[PDB]
Design a protein around this nucleic acid. Sequence first.
DNA 1: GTATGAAAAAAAAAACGCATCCCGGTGCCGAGGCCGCTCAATTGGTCGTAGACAGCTCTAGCACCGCTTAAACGCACGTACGCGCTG
Lengths: 99, 98, 80, 80, 106, 96, 96
Amino acid sequence: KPHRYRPGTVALREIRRYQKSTELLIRKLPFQRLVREIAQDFKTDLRFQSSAVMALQEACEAYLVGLFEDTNLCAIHAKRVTIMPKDIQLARRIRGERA
Amino acid sequence: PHRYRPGTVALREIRRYQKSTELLIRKLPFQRLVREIAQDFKTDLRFQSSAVMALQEACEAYLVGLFEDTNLCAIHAKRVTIMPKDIQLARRIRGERA
Amino acid sequence: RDNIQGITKPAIRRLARRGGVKRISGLIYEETRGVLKVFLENVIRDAVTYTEHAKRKTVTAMDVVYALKRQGRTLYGFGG
Amino acid sequence: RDNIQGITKPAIRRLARRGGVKRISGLIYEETRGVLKVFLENVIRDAVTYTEHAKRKTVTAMDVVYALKRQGRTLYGFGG
Amino acid sequence: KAKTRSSRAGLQFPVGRVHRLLRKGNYSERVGAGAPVYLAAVLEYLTAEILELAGNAARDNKKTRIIPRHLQLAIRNDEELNKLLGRVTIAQGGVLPNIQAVLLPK
Amino acid sequence: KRSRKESYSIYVYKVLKQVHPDTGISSKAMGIMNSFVNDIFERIAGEASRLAHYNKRSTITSREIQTAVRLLLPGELAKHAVSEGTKAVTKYTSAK
Amino acid sequence: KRSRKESYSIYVYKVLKQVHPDTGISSKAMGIMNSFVNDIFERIAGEASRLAHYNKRSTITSREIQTAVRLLLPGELAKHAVSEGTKAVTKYTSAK
DNA sequence: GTATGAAAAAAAAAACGCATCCCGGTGCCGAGGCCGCTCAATTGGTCGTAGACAGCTCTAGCACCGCTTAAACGCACGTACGCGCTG
Ligand SMILES: [Ca+2]
Ligand SMILES: [Ca+2]
Ligand SMILES: [Ca+2]
Ligand SMILES: [K+]
């Protein structure tokens, strides 16, 4: 027969799941290609220690995770539950990341 | 008798103080608050008047800043009136408080 | 009272005006005093710590300047 | 090109989940890519700048570590 | 016979002083003769950049003499100087005039 | 007979009279400018110091300064600074 | 012919076996601990360096370290650290 | 759907008044510039070593390849959240 969890019940489960864990959440290659792509702009025919790329990924994920925590609060502060661009922008504007 | 609508003056005040740079806290009450707080860390302490002035420049600047940020948080909630929870958010995001 | 009340409602209103605030909840005036205190506590503590290290009895501007730099709130026009 | 699309919707969802986000506006997935790019740009630029100063053609972990320290986003466990 | 290093480098800023400040500031064991010139220049350039803009802000206020507020206005209105002096408070600087749109009347 | 307090104020005047010969500067402003110089001096020196340290080199050369400047100043401001620096070193090595 | 890379890892083990003799530590964790030591070392040294500079003194003494530690560590952590530091210097000067 | 009048809501027009901008007008003090003293930068010579350079060694970073399966993608559905409106 049918079974269907109400909208949000899974999201919450996912939250608990990923907070419990420490594994990197972006796929390792697509990231590595994005790194080299961005590094080309500064100098071509560049090589990277695999550890160097991993460090960049640890930093990135950590940064974003953090930005989201802050964003979430901004969303909630507006009596919402759904994060939206303007929430991120506020968080960065206050963090002093942007003007 | 003549009476400006609530907010018309507030706006005028905004324009007035943004235009100017003079310190907005009364110089003595501040100086006493400095010495009062310094007692806690060590008694029979003296202060260069310049040292006190620096603390005041820093303080006002800091607060003015915190308010700008607070204001945005208030507005972000479809409000115009800043409230404690607005400040708290601003500091929580600034990483001033947990 | 002590001196923290010396930071008058109208003075806070003034600061928040320079911050471009239009309307201020009554609760804010005490909230601000508390924050202001926390600031001065953290800055002065360090300033005095510099004073003590110099074996001085007199807090210099520089003591405050050096202290604020540590707190990531650098100040221009009082030296260093 | 645009490996920035390689940063898949579901991967961003995952990150925001670890951030304790429950519901995510469609617009956010592009917004995030942009922010992420700006981050990597700023960090890598510096990393490479350290690489170039060492007259190397190979970006080391340390290059990234030193770079992040500059940006005030210190990283532990890559030889800090 | 003897001329200032500043003169040879075509600078106002004291190459000699800077070279000393570097040795006496526990920055490194030894200080290249090139270093202090270069540094002196950069400091000179930045000084000019700010003064040019402050000097403009002062002409824009019918004042002969630059005051703090001028230096602030100059810095906070130039995208790049703002970003450089992002964590700096300028004594008696005031803030840029700015009233959030939604706060204005209709 | 008071104790000589060093200051960049004479060099700020000289540079001011270049960029606006018909413009002056309040003591307070001049204060801010002195702070500004000392601040960015420490910033560049510091980053140069580390650059040397990181590369197991004992000596801070104009190379380290340049790299520091590229790291510390934003785009346009960096380009200009670097030029002025390179220009000045070039001019000094050629006047021996 | 390998690089001969120094590390605090042996001193972290020794201290670990004191505080929890029946527990060990993943290489990755040990990495983090090495980072941690180096970070706070640089922090304290740095603040000590400036302390000396600011007070026109050429020499970094245990006094400068203490002051640095009082400035850098929060309340309880500072108290403890200072004590352990004072204790350790006292113990060393008295063991000639 | 042509013509209806009755209020409701908005828009414009005409006046009462406070604030703000300009001025020209007067005095005060700090900005500005000069003078003498001094010590901090410059000079010219000696010495020690940092590091640039070439020659060599082998790390580990690149590319490639095929297999399995986990994750990405899409589409369909329907709820509950955002968001406007009201008192
Ligand atoms: Ca602008
Ligand atoms: Ca006149
Ligand atoms: Ca010579
Ligand atoms: K290699």
